[PDB]
Design a protein around this ligand. Sequence first.
Ligand SMILES: Nc1ncnc2c1ncn2[C@H]1C[C@H](O)[C@@H](COP(=O)(O)OP(=O)(O)OP(=O)(O)O)O1
Ligand SMILES: [Ca+2]
Ligand SMILES: [Mn+2]
Length: 430
Amino acid sequence: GPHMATGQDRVVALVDMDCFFVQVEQRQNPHLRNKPCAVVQYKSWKGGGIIAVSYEARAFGVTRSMWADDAKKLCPDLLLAQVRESRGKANLTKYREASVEVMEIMSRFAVIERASIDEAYVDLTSAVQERLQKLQGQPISADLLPSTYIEGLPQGPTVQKEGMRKQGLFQWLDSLQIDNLTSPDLQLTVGAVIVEEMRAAIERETGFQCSAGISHNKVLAKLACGLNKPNRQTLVSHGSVPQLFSQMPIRKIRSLGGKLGASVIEILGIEYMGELTQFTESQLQSHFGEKNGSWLYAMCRGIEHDPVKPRQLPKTIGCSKNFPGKTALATREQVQWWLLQLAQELEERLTKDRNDNDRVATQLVVSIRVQGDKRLSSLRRCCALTRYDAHKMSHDAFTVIKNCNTSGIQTEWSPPLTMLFLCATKFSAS
DNA sequence: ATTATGACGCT
DNA sequence: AGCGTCAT
Ligand SMILES: Nc1ncnc2c1ncn2[C@H]1C[C@H](O)[C@@H](COP(=O)(O)OP(=O)(O)OP(=O)(O)O)O1
Ligand SMILES: [Ca+2]
Ligand SMILES: [Mn+2]
C-alpha cells in the first residue's frame, strides 16, 4: 500500500531522430526531401546495403538490411544516397558530426546520456520542478503540447488521426490536478512541455525532426518514443502501464529482444510483458538470475531505476571492416594494408577527439574474425596506445594478432580474415 | 555477402 | 583480460 514504491520519482525522456542518416542526406541534398529514399553503403554487391529508410520509402516495404537492388524491386523510384568511402571503407563522419549538433542542443536543456548515434536520454526531473514553480499553479494548455500523444487515451465515449490525438490530450488535461506540485502525472505533463520545446529547438537549429518518449524511467521512455513516429512524442504514464503491457510482446522491451527474452517466453510459457506480474521476485530470480529477476519483477510493473548517466561523448572510438566471402584477407600484405587503413582513420578521429574533448585514449583493442566462425569476434587482444600514430598502431595491432596465422608460410594468411577491428579505449583527461 | 559501430555483463 | 549479449 503506502510503502509500495511506484517508480514515479523521476521524469525521463528519450529523444530519437527520425530516419536519421536519411535526414542528414536530405538536408544536404534538397532533391531528396519528401521522397522515398534510403542511405546505402557500398554499391557493387547487389546495389549496396541499406542502412536507413525514409518513411515514404517504408510505405513500399523498404527496410534496413535490404540490398538496394531488392529494394528497387519494391520501389522503382527509390532515391539513394551513399555513405562516404575513405581509405577503402565506409566512413560515418558526416553522421557523427550531425549527431554532435543534436546532442549539444539537447544538453542546453538538461543532462543527457548518449545512447546511440541518434538518440539520448534526458533526465528532466529538476527542469520540471523549476517549470512548475514558474507556472504558479496555472493549467497547461493543449497548445503547449501540439505533437503529444497520451498513451491509452482517448477512452470511453474520432475518424482522423490528429482528431484522435487531440481527443486523448484533452481527456488527459481535463483530468489533471495542477494544484499538487508533486503529482507524477503533472510532472510528466510538464516534462512533455519541455520536450516539445527541445524538439522544436532541434528542428529550428538543425533542420532535423525527431520523436520522443516521456515517462518515469528509461525503458518506458524508449518504448513510448516508438509508439507514435515520426515527428511526434508520446507520454506513457504510470497508470497506462497495465493496459499497455497486457498485449505487449516481451521482445519489445529494451534488453529483452534477444536470448533472455526468448527464455522468459519459453520457460514461463507467456507472451506479453504484463503476464510477468504473476511471478514472485524469487521465482524470476530463480530462472534468470538475481539481477535480471529483480529487474523483471519491477519492470513488468512499470518500474526501473537505471539512471540517466551524465555522458554525452562516446566512451570508445573504433574502426571496423568486414571482408566477406571471397574478399577475405589471405596474404600478410593484405592484412597489413587494411590494418593501416583502419589505423589511419582511427588516428584522424582520435586526433580530432583530443582537440575537441581534452582526453586521450590509452588502450588499443584489436579484434579479428576468421573464416568459418560466424561469431562477430573470433579473437580480441589489447595493447598500449601510447602515441596517436597510424603506422605504430597498425604495427602494434599486427604484432598482437600475427600469432593467429596457422599458415606455415611467411607470406600467406590462414585461415583468411573476414573482419578487422581497431578500437581506442580507456580515456584519460588531457 | 545483414555492415559499422558502441555499451555493458560475466567470469 | 577476453568473451558474450544486445543494441542502433
Ligand atoms: N544495424 C545498423 N547498421 C548500420 N547502421 C545502422 C544500423 N541501425 C541503425 N543505423 C544507423 C542508421 C540510422 O539512420 C541511425 C539511427 O538508427 P535508428 O534510430 O534505429 O533508425 P532510424 O533513425 O533510421 O529510423 P527511425 O525513424 O525508425 O528511428 O543509425
Ligand atoms: Ca531514429
Ligand atoms: Mn535510434
